[PDB]
């Protein structure tokens, strides 16, 4: 076959992976991977062009990002602006793209039956784009809003500060429109020139995943990508920075320039060194810095020419000891030089990656195709699956080679802290970031180059947590499709399901510990939290090995008590669990740690002011709608009465009375489940003298019930971001089969029209979201928007949209209606693809205490019965502006600066303004809880 340079059929894969794979290279030079998965619900494709922002024209910063936007807005064969995205939406799909420095990546997914259709449309992007004239003037605004949202984010400012000291890759209105106009530059022509010059077939990689045979996929990709053109396009210090952040954060970033290690994939020297320097076990860098009271966290490793980084957060004491911190880093590195490369370590890493690969979790299709699409430019067809996991050559010379770059003489150090506020003299141009730059004194350098051996630093030791028993226990005779309650006592309820799907030797063990004293008042909530933070900080050293060994855990405070999840290989899981609970029940608090963690928590309470407007809106709606909720402010205030004595006294009391609800799910037997449950119970009894809680003490909170025909608005100002956010909530009623499918069908139907009208056409903002809101057994319809436009306008536009939608639902045909039905049906019936997603589903059924495990089938069966009439009258009853049962609440978050045709917006009534949340709550009824 003339069209194929070569076919590499065998492609090394995990033996758990039943998908099939075929690699080829087309005539025009494109590398392709094909993936057949006859089980899959969604198909997916991705395309990665090995060009990105580093290749922008010097006079038009941001051009390639802009191009990435422009490819989506129409082709010769499909000229409708959103034919592509509407198709996707109408076929259970979605799509996105990103631009990195050396890559541009476009990917989508879709219902498995319309792959070919999506793909045909997708193919057109690379053959003929319209670059519509009208699309351009709007979309430069889309790009501008993208940058606007990020402006006051700390990470982006650090990112760009490091790069500037150098192009600005993102672009904005200035760089993409204003400045080019001023300088006689035609931007459309430039786009055309860039597209023609750099979007060469030879720089492309495609991956496609679908239900189709490997042969059918082959023909699809041959057909649609053979015709791309191939025009042989060649592939293209000692400074200190003191930076003022937006949030109150304290960090130190240390970075060393290194060569591009990508080609060393068979050894991965940067990962070896990252592994070693980034360790959190006994003997480690972090362990010393933390003992010294200087740091809470450390990350080390390679960052994308390339860099090697080591970043840490800072306690109050640390901020004044940055120089010594760095001295220790250099001592540890010197330790690594002195001992030289270690074959045994490499062998462990190689083994752990091998095991991780054999039992890797099945990926979400979109991510898998996108990721592989990215990495096909770097690896032979046959190795693309394993290249990122499988180490093969031990190469101590490369490891040493990279170690030679981690020297005080090519170091860059950046400190981010509010303490530099006012003490700075430079301003970064694009984001406005205030900072000072200074030469590191040669004497400090000299001292570091002479970093001595301390002995407080040891290599880690053998990881004893490495699992070695992988037997999959056989499926029980009496197995059931949903979790079963296999133990029901005063102290504890145990739900259990043996895995009958995934067949990896893993499990998830979840426990809610209920106690009323965890949330009785702000002080107790603060204490519960500080307690759990202290416990995790103290377990960290021991737990880290386990985490490397595919055993992790999550421990956090909730409104009901405490939450514990242990996941991973079950070979060693009860050992970790036993250490956690035993330490939980016998915890002794170190004072220094208490002061440090308390201070960190104080700052995190403060940092809420710098969240996004829409995060604020969700937060306040949450406060408004829940019977009891403590604000971040109240917690902060209450935080000062937390002393060591008080916490020490609180802990035994918190544990003194409990109820435990658990879901144990994975590769474990009933006897082993009962065993684990009983181990927990007995440990708690032994060490904390726990007794059962009374049935009557199991309070769940209710949701405020809004009055018929009312509209309430709650308004607040964001002090940090110069955008606004709004959330609009139409509360409907309690959950039940029909109300749920009415709301869900409506959300499904209005889902894509809203994006296309409110964002793509009317450009109300970057963030435009809609959908069901479910809390506390109640539900309703919500809208979330973040915008430059004032809230009252957003309101009027959403209301006009809702009317457009009613008219549109009336006017639509039987078949289109059934298409919406069929699409909702597929969405609802989507099987979880990996263990922890199924666990999440069951846990959701359990924590709400609705226990409707077969809800998806009942509701979909019922869904198929519904007609236009039903939805029209639902809408008329619950949603329309003059609906007898309208219940509308709105949260307005004003921009810092903000003050306190188009289809036709209806006249709206005067809203009632909420002055004080507590009064609002006191003055309204509460819903029931949902019956189990």
């Amino acid at each position, epitope marked *: 076959n003339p069209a194929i340079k070569r076919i590499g059929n065998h492609i090394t894969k995990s033996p758990e992976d039943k998908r099939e794979y075929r690699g080829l290279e087309l005539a025009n030079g494109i590398k392709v991977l094909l993936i057949s998965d006859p089980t899959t619900d969604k198909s997916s494709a991705a395309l990665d062009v090995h060009i990105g922002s580093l290749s922008d024209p010097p006079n038009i910063a941001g051009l390639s990002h802009f191009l990435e936007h422009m490819l989506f807005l129409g082709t010769k064969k499909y000229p409708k602006e959103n034919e592509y995205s509407q198709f996707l939406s109408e076929h259970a799909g979605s799509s996105n793209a990103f631009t990195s420095g050396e890559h541009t990546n476009y990917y989508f997914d879709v219902s498995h039956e319309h792959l070919e259709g999506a793909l045909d449309r997708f193919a057109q992007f690379f053959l003929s784009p319209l670059f519509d004239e009208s699309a351009k003037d709007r979309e430069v605004n889309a790009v501008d809003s993208e940058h606007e949202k990020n402006v006051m984010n700390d990470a982006w400012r650090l990112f760009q500060l490091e790069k500037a000291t150098s192009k600005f890759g993102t672009g904005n209105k200035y760089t993409l429109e204003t400045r080019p106009n001023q300088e006689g530059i035609d931007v459309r022509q430039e786009l055309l020139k860039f597209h023609s010059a750099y979007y060469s077939s030879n720089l492309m990689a495609v991956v496609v995943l679908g239900r189709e045979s490997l042969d059918d996929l082959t023909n699809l990709v041959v057909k649609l990508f053979s015709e791309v053109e191939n025009k042989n396009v060649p592939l293209p210090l000692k400074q200190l920075y003191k930076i003022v952040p937006i949030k109150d954060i304290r960090n130190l970033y240390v970075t060393f320039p290194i060569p591009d290690l990508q080609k060393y994939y068979k050894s991965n020297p940067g990962h070896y060194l990252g592994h070693l320097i980034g360790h959190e076990g006994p003997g480690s860098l972090l362990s010393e810095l933390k003992s010294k009271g200087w740091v809470n966290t450390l990350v080390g490793g390679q960052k994308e020419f390339m860099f090697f980084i080591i970043n840490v957060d800072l306690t109050e004491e640390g901020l004044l000891h940055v120089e010594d911190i760095i001295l220790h880093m250099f001592q540890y590195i010197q330790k690594l030089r002195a001992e030289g490369p270690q074959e045994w370590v490499f062998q462990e890493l190689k083994d752990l990656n091998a095991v991780a690969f054999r039992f890797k979790d099945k990926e979400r299709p979109r991510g898998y195709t996108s990721k592989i699409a990215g990495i096909l430019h770097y690896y032979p067809l046959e190795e693309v699956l394993t290249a990122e996991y499988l180490l093969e050559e031990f190469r101590p010379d*490369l490891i040493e080679m990279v170690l030679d770059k981690l020297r005080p003489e090519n170091v860059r150090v950046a400190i981010v802290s509010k303490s530099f506020e006012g003490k700075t003299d430079r301003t970064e141009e694009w984001y406005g970031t205030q900072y000072k730059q200074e030469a590191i004194p040669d004497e400090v350098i000299k001292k570091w180059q002479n970093a001595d051996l301390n002995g407080k630093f040891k290599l880690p030791t053998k990881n004893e947590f490495i699992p070695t028993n992988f037997e999959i226990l056989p499926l029980e005779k009496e197995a059931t499709p949903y979790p079963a309650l296999i133990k029901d006592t005063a102290m504890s309820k145990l739900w259990f399901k043996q895995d009958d799907k995934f067949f990896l030797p893993k499990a998830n063990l979840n426990f809610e510990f209920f106690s009323p004293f965890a949330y009785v008042d702000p002080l107790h909530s603060n204490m519960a939290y500080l307690y759990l933070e202290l416990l995790k900080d103290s377990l960290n050293e021991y737990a880290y090995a386990a985490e490397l060994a595919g055993l992790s855990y999550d421990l956090q405070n909730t409104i009901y008590g405490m939450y514990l999840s242990v996941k991973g290989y079950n070979d060693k899981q009860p050992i970790l669990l036993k250490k956690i609970i035993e330490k939980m029940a016998t915890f002794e608090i170190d004072e220094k740690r208490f002061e440090i963690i308390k201070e960190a928590y104080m700052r995190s309470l403060n940092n809420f002011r710098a969240e996004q407007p829409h995060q604020h809106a969700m937060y306040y709606l949450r406060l408004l709608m829940t019977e009891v909720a403590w604000t971040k402010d109240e917690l902060k205030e209450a935080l000062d009465d937390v002393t060591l004595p008080r916490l020490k006294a609180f802990i035994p009391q918190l544990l003194s009375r409990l109820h435990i609800e658990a879901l144990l799910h994975g590769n474990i037997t009933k006897q082993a489940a009962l065993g684990i449950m009983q181990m927990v119970e007995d440990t708690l009894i032994e060490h904390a003298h726990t007794k059962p809680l009374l049935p009557s003490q199991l309070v769940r909170y209710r949701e405020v019930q809004l009055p018929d025909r009312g509209w309430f608005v709650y308004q607040q100002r964001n002090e940090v971001h110069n955008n606004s956010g709004i959330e609009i909530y139409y509360q409907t009623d309690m959950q039940s089969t029909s109300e749920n499918m009415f709301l869900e069908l409506f959300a499904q139907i209005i889902s894509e029209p809203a994006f296309n009208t409110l964002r793509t056409k009317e450009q109300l903002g970057y963030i435009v979201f809609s959908g069901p809101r479910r809390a506390n057994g109640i539900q309703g319809l919500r809208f979330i928007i973040q915008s430059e436009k004032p809230p009252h306008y957003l309101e009027s536009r959403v209301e006009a949209f809702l009317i457009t939608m009613e008219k549109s639902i009336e006017d639509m045909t039987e078949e289109a209606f059934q298409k919406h039905i069929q699409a909702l049906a597929i969405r609802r019936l989507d099987k979880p693809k990996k263990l922890s997603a199924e666990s999440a589903k069951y846990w959701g059924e359990i924590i709400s205490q609705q226990y409707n495990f077969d809800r998806d089938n009942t509701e979909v069966a019922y869904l198929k019965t519904l007609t236009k009439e039903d939805i029209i009258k639902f809408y008329k009853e619950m949603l329309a502006v003059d609906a007898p049962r309208r219940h509308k609440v709105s949260v307005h978050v004003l921009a810092r600066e903000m003050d306190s045709n188009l289809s036709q917006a209806p006249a709206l009534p005067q809203p009632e303004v909420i002055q004080n949340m507590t009064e609002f709550k006191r003055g309204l009824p509460l819903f029931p809880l949902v019956k189990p």
Partner: antibody
Amino acid sequence: EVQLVESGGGLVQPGGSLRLSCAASGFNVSSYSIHWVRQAPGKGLEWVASISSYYGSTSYADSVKGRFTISADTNTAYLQMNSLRAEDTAVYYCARDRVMYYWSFSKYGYPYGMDYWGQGTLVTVSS
Amino acid sequence: MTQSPSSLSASVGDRVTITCRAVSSAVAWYQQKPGKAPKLLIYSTSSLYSGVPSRFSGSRSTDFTLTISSLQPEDFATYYCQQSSPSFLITFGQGTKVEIKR
């Protein structure tokens, strides 16, 4: 099919000059290391010089320091002999490193093999 | 640095062992037939090059040792133990001449 070729050997009046060429084929000299190893007549294997063209590094034997030069054009390597003593008469072989991107600068050396050698050229030096 | 011995002699089918004593704590092996260029036998002091007879093993007791268990009639050549050291330096031994024994 990887392979090497040596060329330039002949008969040179002592204190003369010669330029050998290790014509490479099947791989790029840029990301491999080219060694030059001369055997005497009836004596043992002796190493002369080497070059890592990626790290642009070179290395010569203490037998010849300011009388030899190893360089390479990226697809051949060239050993340049200057003022050749009567004892430099021998057979020179040139090999490459089995592993790519060997790091020249090192503290502990790692004996990787050399998988592909040339079949040498014999330079005879006598007046 | 050194090798042992000057040479070795033995029958076909016999067991020959060469010891090369040597920073760099490894060693590689080459088999040279009289006249031709050297041939690579073992690279990591343990593992052998690709497409080499399985009868060549690299061992270590300290000293390093190449071993020919089922010596054939075409494995009668000179054997070189090489080192690679700091400073980009290469170094071979004086050669082990394996001779056939009548």
